[PDB]
Scaffold this active site. Structure first.
Site, short mmCIF file in Angstrom:
data_model
loop_
_atom_site.label_atom_id
_atom_site.label_comp_id
_atom_site.label_asym_id
_atom_site.label_seq_id
_atom_site.Cartn_x
_atom_site.Cartn_y
_atom_site.Cartn_z
N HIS A 1 1.00 -1.25 0.28
CA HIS A 1 -0.05 -0.08 -0.13
C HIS A 1 0.80 1.20 0.03
CE1 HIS A 1 1.15 -0.72 4.28
NE2 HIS A 1 0.85 0.44 4.30
N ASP B 1 1.12 -8.66 2.05
CA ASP B 1 1.22 -7.11 2.14
C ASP B 1 2.71 -6.86 1.89
OD1 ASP B 1 0.97 -4.20 2.33
OD2 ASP B 1 -0.10 -4.36 4.10
N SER C 1 6.01 2.72 8.10
CA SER C 1 5.62 1.27 7.74
C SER C 1 6.73 0.72 6.95
CB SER C 1 4.26 1.04 6.85
OG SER C 1 4.52 1.63 5.70
#
Lengths: 163, 49, 48, 163
Positions: free
Chosen positions: A40, A62, A114
């Site tokens: 993302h 992810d 992240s």
């Protein structure tokens, strides 16, 4: 503050920010001889060699894994699976690991931090931070990690926000 | 006499309709069983933590 | 009428005993603070 | 002495008394992210957050229980399956653990003493008091507890009183 100096001095060589319009959205991590990058996070890798790659997608975990050239395979994070309970050393200080869950004291954790690795007292990556949810006075984390069998495991608490 | 529906279907052609239509069901059920076993084995591997 | 009455009483009493046994199996695992149901009992008694 | 004061510091944050019309009838415990309330105690939990939550009932173990909201999950007690013999802590002094029986020297333990979590030498809950009987010169208790498998175990002596 001594553990955070170790984390910054290990991230100064092996961590690359993913910049979109100059703004930091995430961090590519070079651990164990393979490039890692979350889904993302939008932008490009700061390093010019790593940005010109073909990252194979893996949409469940992810992550967007790649491979590292042979001249760079020694300049990688080392890692392990071994994780007793106690404290580990995150980028912003310490992180508690209890009952198989990484928890940070609250306030910190927003859009952008992240892909940061979690280190141990030896200097090995045990987790890669993807996101987390604020459980009041303490924030649980959604990370990927490994185990003794040699299997990539992702842990995900309830209602986690992608960072 | 009276032409029944499916009167002249000629057991050879019953075999061709049983294999090329019932065998595809066998393919899809072994694919579904394989998918179920794979999902349970992935959950067993992620029981390790 | 007596066959319908015996059939209704038997189905209702068996469903009552089945619900009692399902509660008596799933209750010592729902009371724990983690509520980590073992997988085989979650397959059998239709747990979470 | 000293033992009761850290227990008061813990109970001031997470042990919540119930509100009968003028007095206190019992104490709701928040442990592991699951609110516990005894059945024979009737009233209202002091928090308006913990009051609105509908509780599921377990009549064999004499405890209503409900789910804790996500913010409150980090600020809960901790629970332990392993208990060796010796001395444990409690709001009214100390409690002896011998042959699997939580016993208390007499003179204390009456109405309005329900749901008080028996702590340990670290700060983790090992039992929840629901009542007891006067076994001569020393009273025993009727607690629920946990074991190694994850099975809630209730022990109750002969002719106990629902406190």
């Amino acid at each position: 503050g001594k553990r955070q100096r170790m984390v910054m001095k290990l991230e100064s060589d092996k961590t690359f920010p993913i910049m979109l319009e100059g703004k930091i959205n995430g961090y590519a991590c070079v651990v164990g001889g393979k490039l890692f990058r979350p889904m993302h996070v939008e932008g490009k890798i700061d390093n010019d060699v790593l940005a010109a790659l073909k990252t194979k997608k893996a949409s469940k975990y992810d992550l967007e894994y790649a491979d590292v050239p042979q001249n760079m395979r020694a300049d990688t994070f080392k890692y392990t699976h071994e994780k007793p309970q106690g404290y580990y050393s995150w980028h912003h200080g310490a992180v508690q690991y209890e009952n198989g869950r990484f928890t940070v004291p609250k306030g910190v954790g927003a859009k952008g931090d992240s892909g940061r690795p979690i280190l141990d007292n030896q200097g090995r990556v045990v987790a890669i931070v993807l996101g987390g949810v604020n459980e009041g006075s303490r924030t649980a984390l959604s990370v990927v990690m490994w185990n003794e069998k040699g299997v990539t495991v992702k842990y995900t608490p309830e209602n986690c926000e992608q960072w | 006499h009276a032409q029944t529906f499916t009167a002249a279907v000629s057991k050879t052609a019953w075999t061709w309709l049983t294999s090329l239509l019932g065998g595809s069901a066998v393919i899809i059920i072994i694919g579904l069983v394989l998918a179920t076993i794979v999902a349970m084995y992935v959950l067993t591997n992620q029981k390790h933590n | 009428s007596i066959c319908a009455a015996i059939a209704t009483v038997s189905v209702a009493a068996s469903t009552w005993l089945f619900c009692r046994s399902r509660v008596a199996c799933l209750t010592p695992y729902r009371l724990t603070p983690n509520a980590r149901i073992p997988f085989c009992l979650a397959v059998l008694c239709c747990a979470r």
